[PDB]
């Protein structure tokens, strides 16, 4: 379920969220009874958007950006509070990123990618590009996405995930293949087969850009490629970005 009428959440989207909780949680109705209209709920602090001294190295800034993203918390409610239309102009998506920082609600992988671009537009020596995954577990397909980053010729990632090892990577990987193979290993450890990796182009640092994000500049079928060709195609995508 996706909130499609912005904030505050309209009456219909709100009931739907609480209907969904009623079916998913064993005590679903008791959860709604305890929370809905409760006058003794914790006040959640609005997390502070991190701002950076020009003396702070980019890797340290990325740590603060990831901490901010984590502080919003992974959205387990079953209702996404922000609609992300992936084909929208960057300027529209960065308007959404700003509203995410002002309203400060839980988020999932795609929202974290938009936030990551927004909070690193101040870092022109950092290149940002989305990396999407399609995985298989127990007869079902799963989709995930992170923000690949490149600083000083080394690859890292920002993002939001259920699992610690499927989001943040410090920019220490010497090649793009070493970064993506670390994700593939993490998936292998939680018994997922990696089927496809989709790699985007460098995103503009201009938050008023009318350009779209290119999400699928490279689509790599891991199984059809095999080990060697998969590394070659990842390295080819790394060169394409460095030269453009």
């Amino acid at each position: 379920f996706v909130n499609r009428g912005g904030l505050p959440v309209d009456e219909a989207t709100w009931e739907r969220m609480w209907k969904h909780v009623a079916k998913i949680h064993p005590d679903g109705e008791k959860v709604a009874q305890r929370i809905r209209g409760a006058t003794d709920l914790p006040k959640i602090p609005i997390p502070s958007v991190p701002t950076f001294q020009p003396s702070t190295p980019v890797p340290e800034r990325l740590e603060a950006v990831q901490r901010y993203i984590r502080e919003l918390q992974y959205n387990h409610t079953g209702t996404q509070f922000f609609e992300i239309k992936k084909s929208r102009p960057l300027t529209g998506l960065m308007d959404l990123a700003k509203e995410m920082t002002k309203e400060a609600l839980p988020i999932k992988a795609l929202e974290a990618v938009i936030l990551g671009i927004y909070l690193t537009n101040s870092m022109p020596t950092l290149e940002r590009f989305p990396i999407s995954f399609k995985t298989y577990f127990s007869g079902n397909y799963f989709r995930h996405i992170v923000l690949g980053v490149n600083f000083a010729g080394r690859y890292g990632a920002l993002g939001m995930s259920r699992r610690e090892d499927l989001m943040y990577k410090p920019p220490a990987f010497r090649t793009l293949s070493e970064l993506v193979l670390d994700f593939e290993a993490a998936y292998g450890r939680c018994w997922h087969v990696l089927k496809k990796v989709k790699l985007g182009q460098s995103v503009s640092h201009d938050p008023h850009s009318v350009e779209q994000i290119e999400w699928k500049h490279s689509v790599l079928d891991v199984e059809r490629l095999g080990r060697d060709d998969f590394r070659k195609e990842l390295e080819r995508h790394a060169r394409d970005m460095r030269l453009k």
Binding site: P8, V21, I24, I35, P42, K43, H76, G78, E103, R162
Partner: peptide, 28 residues
Amino acid sequence: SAQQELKQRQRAEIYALNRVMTELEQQQ
């Protein structure tokens, strides 16, 4: 503001809910 009070009330219920559902998903 009525709209602000509404977002504050909703935000507090969203995080109380998110804690409960995080604890649920934590015990698959």
